[PDB]
Amino acid sequence: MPLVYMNIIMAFAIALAGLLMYRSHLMSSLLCLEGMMLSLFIMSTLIILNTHFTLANMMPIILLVFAACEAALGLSLLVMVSNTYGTDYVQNLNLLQC
Amino acid sequence: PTIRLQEDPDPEDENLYEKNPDSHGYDKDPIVDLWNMRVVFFFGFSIVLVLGSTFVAYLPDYRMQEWARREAERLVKYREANGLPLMESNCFDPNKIQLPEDED
Amino acid sequence: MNPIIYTTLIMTVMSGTMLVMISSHWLLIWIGFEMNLLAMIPVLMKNFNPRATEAATKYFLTQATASMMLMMAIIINLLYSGQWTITKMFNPVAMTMMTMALAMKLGLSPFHFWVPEVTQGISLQAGLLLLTWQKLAPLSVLCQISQSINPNLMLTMAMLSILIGGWGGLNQTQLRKIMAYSSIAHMGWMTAVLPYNTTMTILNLLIYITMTLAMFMLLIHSSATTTLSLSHTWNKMPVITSLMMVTLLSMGGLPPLSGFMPKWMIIQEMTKNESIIMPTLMAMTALLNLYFYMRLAYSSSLTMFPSTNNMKMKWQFEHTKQMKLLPTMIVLSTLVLPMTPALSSLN
Amino acid sequence: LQYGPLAFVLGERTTRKLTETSKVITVDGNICSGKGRLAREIAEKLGLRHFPEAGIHYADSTTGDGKPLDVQLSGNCSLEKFYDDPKSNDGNSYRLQSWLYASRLLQYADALEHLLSTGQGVVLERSIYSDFVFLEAMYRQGFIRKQCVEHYNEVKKVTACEYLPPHVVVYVDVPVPEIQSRIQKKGNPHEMKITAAYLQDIENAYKKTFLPEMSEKCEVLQYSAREAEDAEKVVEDIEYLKCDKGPWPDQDDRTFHRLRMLVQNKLEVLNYTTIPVYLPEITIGAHQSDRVFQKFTELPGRKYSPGYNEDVGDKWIWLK
Amino acid sequence: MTMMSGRPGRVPLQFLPNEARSLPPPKLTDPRLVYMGFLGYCSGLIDNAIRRRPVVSAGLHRQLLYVTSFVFFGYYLLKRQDYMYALRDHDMFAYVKSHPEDFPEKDKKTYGEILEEFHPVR
Amino acid sequence: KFYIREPPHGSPDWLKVGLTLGTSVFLWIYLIKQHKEDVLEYKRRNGLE
Amino acid sequence: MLKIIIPTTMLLPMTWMSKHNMIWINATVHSLLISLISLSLLNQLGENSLNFSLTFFSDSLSAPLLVLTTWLLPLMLMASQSHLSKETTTRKKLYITMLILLQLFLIMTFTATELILFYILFEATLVPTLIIITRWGNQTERLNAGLYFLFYTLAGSLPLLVALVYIQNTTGSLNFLIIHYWSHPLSNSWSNIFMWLACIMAFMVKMPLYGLHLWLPKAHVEAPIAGSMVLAAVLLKLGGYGMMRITTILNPLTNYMAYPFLMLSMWGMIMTSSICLRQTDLKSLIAYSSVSHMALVIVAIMIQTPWSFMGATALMIAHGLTSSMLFCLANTNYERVHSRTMILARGLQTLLPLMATWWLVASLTNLALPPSINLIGELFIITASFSWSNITIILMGMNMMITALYSLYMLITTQRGKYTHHINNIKPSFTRENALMALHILPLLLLTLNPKMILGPLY
Ligand SMILES: CCCCCCCCCCCCCCCCCC(=O)OC[C@H](COP(=O)([O-])OCC(O)COP(=O)([O-])OC[C@@H](COC(=O)CCCCCCCCCCCCCCCCC)OC(=O)CCCCCCCCCCCCCCCCC)OC(=O)CCCCCCCCCCCCCCCCC
Ligand SMILES: CCCCCCCCCCCCCCCCC[C@@H](O)O[C@H](CO[C@H](O)CCCCCCCCCCCCCCC)COP(=O)(O)OCC[N+](C)(C)C
Ligand SMILES: CCCCCCCCCCCCCCCCC[C@@H](O)O[C@H](CO[C@H](O)CCCCCCCCCCCCCCC)COP(=O)(O)OCC[N+](C)(C)C
Ligand SMILES: CCCCCCCCCCCCCCCCC[C@@H](O)O[C@H](CO[C@H](O)CCCCCCCCCCCCCCC)COP(=O)(O)OCC[N+](C)(C)C
Ligand SMILES: CCCCCCCC/C=C\CCCCCCCC(=O)O[C@H](COC(=O)CCCCCCC/C=C/CCCCCCCC)COP(=O)(O)OCCN
Ligand SMILES: Nc1ncnc2c1ncn2[C@@H]1O[C@H](COP(=O)(O)OP(=O)(O)O)[C@@H](O)[C@H]1O
C235 burial class (0-12, 13-18, 19+ CB within 10 angstroms)? buried
Phi, psi dihedral angles at D29 (to 5 degrees): 145, 165
**Kind of pairing between the strands at D220-224 and D122-124:** unpaired
User: In a 3-state reduction of DSSP, which class is residue E35?
Assistant: helix
Residue D213 annotated as lining a ligand binding site: no
Task: Report the C-alpha dihedral over residues B81, B85, B88, B89, rounded to 10 degrees.
Answer: 180
C307 at interface of D, judged by CB pairs closer than 8 A:
yes
Total residues found in chain A within this entry: 98
Interface of E with F in 83-122 (CB under 8 A): none
CB distance C62 to C102 below 8 Å? no
Furthest C-alpha separation in chain A: 51
Q: CA C279 to CA C286: how far, in whole Å?
A: 11
Q: Evaluate whether F30 touches D91 at the Cβ level (below 8 Å).
A: no
The β-bridge relationship of strands D168-173 and G50-51 is: unpaired
Alpha carbon distance C296, C301 (integer Å)? 8
Q: Which chains touch F (3 or more CB pairs under 8 A)?
A: D, E
Question: What are the sequence ranges of the domains in chain A?
Answer: 3-92
Torsion-angle region of G101 (φ positive above 0: left; ψ -120 to 50: alpha; else: beta): alpha
DSSP state of C174: B
User: What distance in Å separates the CA atoms of residue G206 and residue G24, rounded to the nearest whole number?
Assistant: 31
Collect all residues of chain B within an 8 Å Cβ-Cβ radius of residue E115. Answer: 99-100
Q: Residues E25, E29, E30, CA angle at the centre, nearest 5°? A: 60
Out of A19, A51, A73, the one facing C38 most closely (by C-beta) is A73
Beta carbons within 8 Å of D72's beta carbon, 6+ residues apart: D292, D295
Residue type, C145: I
Whether domain A3-92 has CATH 1.10.287.3510 = yes
Contact D203, D187 (CB under 8 A): no
Tell whether F24 lies on the interface with E, counting CB pairs under 8 A.
yes
What is the DSSP secondary structure assignment for residue G412, as one 8-state letter? H
Radius of gyration of chain E (CA): 25
Judge if the beta carbon of residue G282 lies within 6 A of ligand 5: no
Is D217 annotated as a binding-site member? no
Cβ atoms of G146 and G215 within 8 Å: the answer is no
Distance from CA of E18 to the nearest CA of F (A): 11
Size of interface B-D (CB pairs under 8 A): 30
**What sections of F1-49 are H helices per DSSP?**
14-45
User: What's the number of CA atoms in the CB half-sphere (13 Å) around residue D143?
Assistant: 25
Scan residues 241-270 of G and list those with Cβ closer than 8 Å to C.
Answer: none
What's the order of all strands across the beta sheet hosting D49-51?
D49-51, D122-124, D25-29, D168-173, D220-224
Cα E49 off chain centre by: 32
G329 touches G362 (CB < 8 A)? yes
User: How many angstroms is the resolution?
Assistant: 2.6
Under an 8 A CB cutoff, do B39 and G25 touch? yes
Report the interhelical angle of C277-297 vs G141-171 (nearest 10°): 150
Contact E68, F28 (CB under 8 A): yes
Q: Where are the alpha helices (H) located in G251-391, listed in sequence order? A: 254-257, 259-275, 282-303, 306-337, 348-351, 353-366, 373-388
Q: How far is the CA of D126 from the centre of ligand 6 (A)?
A: 10
Sequence-ordered list of residues with C-beta below 8 angstroms from that of C340, at least 6 positions apart, any chain? C261, C264, C265
Give the distance (Å) from ligand 3 centre to CA of residue C345.
7
* Helices G373-388 and G306-337, axial angle in degrees (round to 10): 140
CB–CB of D163/D112 below 8 Å? yes
Give the ligand with the smallest distance to the CA of G317: 2
Contact between chains at C335 and E3 (C-beta distance less than 8 A): no
Q: Do chains B and A touch (3 or more CB pairs under 8 A)?
A: no
Check if the beta carbon of residue G52 is closer than 8 Å to that of residue G1.
yes
CB count in 10 Å sphere of residue G310: 24
Question: What is the C-alpha to C-alpha distance for residues D221 and D234, in angstroms, rounded to an integer?
Answer: 9
- What is the spatial distance between Cα E50 and Cα D48, in angstroms, rounded to a whole number? 39
Q: Cα(A42)–Cα(A50) distance, rounded to whole angstroms?
A: 12
d(CA G183, ligand 5 centre) in Å: 21
Angstrom distance (rounded) from CA G23 to CA D163: 52
Contacts of A45 (CB under 8 A, 6+ apart): A60
Which residues in chain G are contacts of E122 at CB distance < 8 A? 387
The CA–CA distances, whole Å, from E77 to E81, E87, G196 equal 6, 15, 40
G446 and G50 Cβ atoms separated by less than 8 Å: no
Chain D positions in Cβ-Cβ contact with residue C46 (cut-off 8 Å): none
Separation in Å, CA of C19 to nearest CA in chain A = 15
d(CA G200, CA G253): 12
Helix axes C51-80, C92-106, angle to 10 degrees: 160
How far apart are alpha carbons G380 and D67 in whole angstroms? Answer: 76
Q: Residues 6 or more apart from B26 whose CB is under 8 A from it?
A: B32, B33, B34, B36, B37, B40, G24, G81, G430, G431, G432
The answer to whether G255 and E119 have CB atoms below 8 angstroms apart is: yes
- Other Cβ atoms less than 10 A from the Cβ of G320: the count is 26
Sign of the torsion angle spanned by Cα atoms B43, B48, B49, B51: positive
Task: Please report, for chain C, how many H helices and E strands are present, in that order.
Answer: 16, 1
User: In a 3-state reduction of DSSP, which class is residue C99?
Assistant: helix
Distance, CA of G455 to CA of G459 (rounded, Å):
6
Report CA C51 to chain centroid distance, whole Å: 21
Pick from F21, F30, F41: which is nearest to E21 by CB? F41
DSSP D169: E
CB pair distance less than 8 Å for D90 and B1:
yes
What technique solved it? cryo-EM
Nearest Cα to C213, choosing from C309, C332, C132, C124?
C132
Classify each residue of D41-67 as buried b or exposed e, where b means 16 or more C-beta atoms within 10 Å of its C-beta. Answer: bbbeebebebbebbbbbbbbbebbeee
The one-letter code for the residue type at F36 is K
Question: Residue D29: enclosing H or E segment and its boundaries?
Answer: strand D25-29
User: What residues are paired with D168 via a beta bridge?
Assistant: D25
Contact B4 D280 (CB under 8 A): yes
| G-chain residues near B38 (CB < 8 A) | none
Spatial separation of the C-alpha atoms in residues D113 and C340, rounded to whole Å = 50
Cβ-Cβ contacts under 8 Å for G430 (sequence gap 6 or more)? B16, B23, B24, B25, B26
CA distance D160 to D130: 11
Alpha-carbon distance D175 to D32, whole Å? 11
Strands in G20-85 per DSSP E: 50-51, 57-58
> Which residues neighbour F42 within 8 Å (Cβ) at sequence distance 6 or greater?
E21, E22, E23, E24, E25, F48
D32 is in an annotated binding site: yes
Query: Cβ–Cβ contacts within 10 Å for residue G360, how many?
Result: 14
Say which ligand is closest to the CA of G313: 2
Q: Report d(CA C319, CA C94) in Å as an integer.
A: 52
User: How far away, in angstroms, is G177 Cα from ligand 5 center?
Assistant: 26
> How many angstroms separate the CA atoms of D149 and D155, rounded?
10
| Chain D contact present for E21, CB below 8 A | no
Q: Cβ contacts (< 8 Å) between D306 and chain F: which residues?
A: 2, 6, 9
Nearest to D251 by CA among D17, D10, D78, D46: D17
Determine how many CB atoms are found less than 10 A away from the CB of residue G291: 26
Is D125 marked as a binding-site residue? yes
Residues of F in contact with D312 (CB under 8 A): 1-2
| Long-range contacts formed by A89-92: CB under 8 A, 24+ apart | A89/A24, A89/A25, A89/A26, A90/A22, A90/A24, A90/A25, A90/A26, A90/A29, A91/A24
Q: Does G369 touch chain C (CB under 8 A)?
A: no
- CA geometry: angle at C296 spanning C294 and C301, to 5°? 95
Q: Which of G262, G240, G259, G255 is nearest to G311 (CA)?
A: G240
Distance C288 CA to ligand 1 centre (A): 33
CA distance C326 to chain G (A): 22
Any contact of F with A, at least 3 CB pairs below 8 A? no
Task: Please give the Cα distance from G215 to G133 (Å, whole number).
Answer: 13
Alpha-carbon distances of C289 from C30, C163, C177, C186, D225, rounded to whole Å: 34, 10, 13, 10, 68
